[PDB]
């Protein structure tokens, strides 16, 4: 039943915490709600996507090119965690 990995598994939900928390934090700076920078739904699929470049998270469901300017921050955790971190990056099925 499961297709991915135990290990990837946990990579997926490391990484989301990490989202989780910039997220806050520029939402605070912003000062808007968490959920207008990005939805929980958004910050799973970056998690499970790992997209590094603006191009990349783009193709993300929900975000558009003025969101993916927000999420600039985000892209820096993810590629900073995917390096100290030897996992793969921008998984992409088309
Ligand atoms: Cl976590």
Known sequence: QPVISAQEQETQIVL?????????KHANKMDVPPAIL?????????????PTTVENVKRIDGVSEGKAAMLAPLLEVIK???????VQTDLFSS
């Not at 990490?18 to 997220?23: C, D, I, P, T």
């Not at 990005?38 to 790992?50: G, P, Q, S």
């Not at 900073?80 to 030897?86: E, V």
């Open 80 to 86: 900073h965690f995917c390096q100290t971190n030897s």
């Open 16 to 24: 989301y915490g990490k989202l989780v928390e910039a997220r806050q």
């Open 38 to 50: 990005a939805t929980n739904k958004i910050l799973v699929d970056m998690a499970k996507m790992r």
